[PDB]
């Protein structure tokens, strides 16, 4: 099921700046005029995950957004005493339970368009409250893909 909402070119450009150039840490997307996904906030490369959570919620408790984040965490391979830094890109659909049905429908039905436009994302995360968006929750999901 699709809404027909399109993805702006800037979204793709910003995505490449994060994935390939490592220029930015994360980006927040929003749907402009119910017609097109566009870039709302771009954070510098040194930005932390807490800032990401603040930014994605900054527009209010009923507002929906998408968030892309280049997440870094430590991974210890079984049998090796050495922890290596892993980086994985995830894309989050933020649709708080407090959001109105129209907004929820709009964002959920537009998410696939964004996914298809951003090739190479490792994990797609659905979040409706902070328990699902927390660092711990996200990290757990990302690790689940870690090749043992």
């Amino acid at each position: 099921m699709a809404s027909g909402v399109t993805v702006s070119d800037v979204c793709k450009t910003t995505y490449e700046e994060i994935k390939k150039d490592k220029k930015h840490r994360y980006v927040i997307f929003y749907i402009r005029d119910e017609k097109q996904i566009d870039v709302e906030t771009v954070a510098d490369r040194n930005a932390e995950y807490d800032q990401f959570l603040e930014d994605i919620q900054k527009c209010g408790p009923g507002e929906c957004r998408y968030g892309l984040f280049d997440f870094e965490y430590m991974h210890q391979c079984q049998g090796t005493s050495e922890s290596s830094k892993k980086q994985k890109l995830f894309l989050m659909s933020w649709c708080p339970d407090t959001a109105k049905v129209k907004k929820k429908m709009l964002y959920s039905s537009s998410f696939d368009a964004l996914k298809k436009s951003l090739v190479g994302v490792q994990k797609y995360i659905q979040a409706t409250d902070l328990s699902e968006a927390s660092r711990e929750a996200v990290e757990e999901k990302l690790r689940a893909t870690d090749r043992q």
Partner: protein, 361 residues
């Protein structure tokens, strides 16, 4: 910082020189839809239900270059998120890699990825050096293949290198089979990963296999539990040590081959008599499949039994041996003095792909 890429049959390890561990470790697989045009690594693995999965490296040898390029593309742009044209690249290769493959690899790095410099190193030699030795024999066992590689003063002895097409992946399959016999059924690829996880966490090598079998029959002391993702707890018994036994007894898998201890012995015997003593006294374990608890002791025991009685036997199992190859490459490539050892793009343009044989060997 230089990029270091260890090309394994089943796993690709990649990161930046100077790091203590690879940044990225992922399956070396390319998937295509049965009915993006292609998926690589973890992504391919996560979609395995709808994809045909292929390994571009078979038993240490690249057999599919198109797919290998995709793996490297995925390594540089998706996993490491770097432009290869900005970084020298150290690549590892298996022992007995054909010259043509080496040249093809060199060609692709300079012409397709436009790297400014590159170096190729033999996996077993890196592992040996990482242990502070220049002379010894390496038992390298990864996901897809096991090699015994005698090395004398830094030179691998090709005539004495032996290959066993049995390694981690085969053991995972074997474990799946014997768990099924116990009543646990793992039939899906996703489930296979679970079994891999069980294998890596719970399996071990028995010092005496027969005695251990007897113990397992008479007591539950060897049993361990594993919680599945769905919350179900399963109990694993003698499968814990039967699985890796296949390395010592390939007949468990129906293979008419010598086990890794015999293969090691046979490799030593193929060498000159004057260096055998050094090889016995310097057997280095390397690779993920060598991480089984007890394997070093078992090897020690088995080789002692095979070797002349006067021979000193020493098995070396570094703690970091899971990534010994990569770590060796990482350290080497991080040295400021190593910069002179690279094949430069200029040298490649002048001499062609054959330059790799002069500069790296």
């Amino acid at each position: 910082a230089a990029l270091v890429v260890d090309n394994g049959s089943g796993m690709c390890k990649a990161g930046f020189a100077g790091d203590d561990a690879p940044r990225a470790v992922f399956p070396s697989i390319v998937g295509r839809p049965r009915h993006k045009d292609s998926y690589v690594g973890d992504e391919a693995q996560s979609k395995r239900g709808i994809l045909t999965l292929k390994y571009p490296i078979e038993h240490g040898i690249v057999t599919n270059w198109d797919d290998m390029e995709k793996i490297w593309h995925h390594t540089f742009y998706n996993e490491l998120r770097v432009a290869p044209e900005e970084h020298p690249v150290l690549l590892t290769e298996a022992p007995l890699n054909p010259k043509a493959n080496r040249e093809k690899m060199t060609q692709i790095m300079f012409e397709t990825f436009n790297t400014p410099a590159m170096y190729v190193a033999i996996q077993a030699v890196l592992s040996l050096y990482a242990s502070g030795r220049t002379t010894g024999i390496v038992l390298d066992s990864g996901d897809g293949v096991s090699h015994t590689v005698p090395i004398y003063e830094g030179y691998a002895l090709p005539h004495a290198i032996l290959r066993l097409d049995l390694a981690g992946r085969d053991l995972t399959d074997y474990l799946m089979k014997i768990l099924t016999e116990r009543g646990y059924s793992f039939t899906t690829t996703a489930e296979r990963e679970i079994v891999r996880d069980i294998k890596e966490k719970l399996c071990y090598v028995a010092l005496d296999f027969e005695q251990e079998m007897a113990t397992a029959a008479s007591s539950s002391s060897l049993e361990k539990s594993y919680e599945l993702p769905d919350g179900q707890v399963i109990t694993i018994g003698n499968e814990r040590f039967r699985c890796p036994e296949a390395l010592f007894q390939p007949s468990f898998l129906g293979m008419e081959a010598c086990g890794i201890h015999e293969t090691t012995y046979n490799s030593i015997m193929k060498c000159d008599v004057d260096i055998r003593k050094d090889l016995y006294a310097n057997t280095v374990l390397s690779g993920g499949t060598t991480m089984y608890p007890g394997i070093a002791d078992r090897m020690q025991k088995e080789i002692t039994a095979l070797a002349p009685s006067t021979m000193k036997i020493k098995i070396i199992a570094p703690p970091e041996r899971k990534y010994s190859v990569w770590i060796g490459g990482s350290i080497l490539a991080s040295l400021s003095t190593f910069q002179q050892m690279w094949i430069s793009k200029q040298e490649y343009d002048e001499s062609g792909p054959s330059i790799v044989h002069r500069k790296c060997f």
